[PDB]
Design a protein around this ligand. Structure first.
Ligand SMILES: [Zn+2]
Ligand SMILES: [Zn+2]
Ligand SMILES: [Zn+2]
Ligand SMILES: [Zn+2]
Lengths: 89, 89
DNA sequence: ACCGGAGGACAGTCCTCCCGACTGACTGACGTCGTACG
DNA sequence: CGTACGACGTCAGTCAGTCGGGAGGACTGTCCTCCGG
C-alpha cells in the first residue's frame, strides 16, 4: 500500500517495488518509505479526555483572570505572547 | 430504528410503534422517543482545534503553577475552596 | 429482569492517485528596417 | 533616389509539465440496537 515519499509529495502512482521504484529509479532519485506519522487517537474517549480538561482549565482560569483574557490565550500561538500575557498580571 | 427511552434503558427489543409501543402500552408505561442527543463532532480537525486550545492553556498554567499538583486543584469542585487556595499565590 | 458486549450500519479518516487547470517555454509567423541594386 | 528582398526581432499561440483540489475507497472507530447468560 505505502507510496514512496516523493510519489506522495508529487501525487503520481507509485510502482512501490523493492528497494526503489520506477520514477525514483528512472528519474534518478533516492526513493524512501518514511514511517507513518504518529497522531493522537481519534476516539471518542480521547476527544472527551481532551475536551473535558480543556474545560476545567478554562474554569480555573476564570477564577484568576477575566474572561476577555481567556479568549486571547485560547488563540495565541507564540510562547512570548503567552508569557507576556501573564506578566501584565 | 430509534428504540424507546425505556426499551433503551432496559435493553430489550423495541416494537417501535408510535405513540405508545409494545411494553410501554402493556405495562401502561410512560413511552418516550427522546431526541437524538448531541456530541461534538468526532473529526480530526476538531480533535486538533481542541488540542491546540488545551496546549495553550496548558502552557499558561505551567507559568501560573510552576509547582505541582495542578491536578490536585483541577479535581476540586468548590469555588470558595479553590479561591481560598489560590490566594496562596 | 438486568446489563456486558456482539453485531452491524454508519460517520469520518487518511491514504494513494487520477484528472483538470494554469503557467511557462518554445516555435512560427508577420512586420519593420536596412542594405543593395537598378 | 526609390523599390524590393532578406534578415532579425517581437508577439502570439500551442503544447507540455507541474502543483493542487480532491475522488476513490479501505479502514478505524462510533454508537446504536437488543441478544442471551
Ligand atoms: Zn514511488
Ligand atoms: Zn520512489
Ligand atoms: Zn419501546
Ligand atoms: Zn416505549
Amino acid at each position: 500500500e505505502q507510496a514512496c515519499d516523493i510519489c506522495r509529495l508529487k501525487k503520481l502512482k507509485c510502482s512501490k517495488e523493492k528497494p526503489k521504484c520506477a520514477k525514483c529509479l528512472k528519474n534518478n532519485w533516492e526513493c524512501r518509505y518514511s514511517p507513518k506519522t504518529k497522531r493522537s487517537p481519534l476516539t471518542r474517549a480521547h476527544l472527551t479526555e481532551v475536551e473535558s480538561r480543556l474545560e476545567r482549565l478554562e474554569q480555573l482560569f476564570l477564577l484568576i483572570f477575566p474572561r476577555e483574557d481567556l479568549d486571547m490565550i485560547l488563540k495565541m500561538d507564540s510562547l512570548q505572547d503567552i508569557k507576556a500575557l501573564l506578566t501584565g498580571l
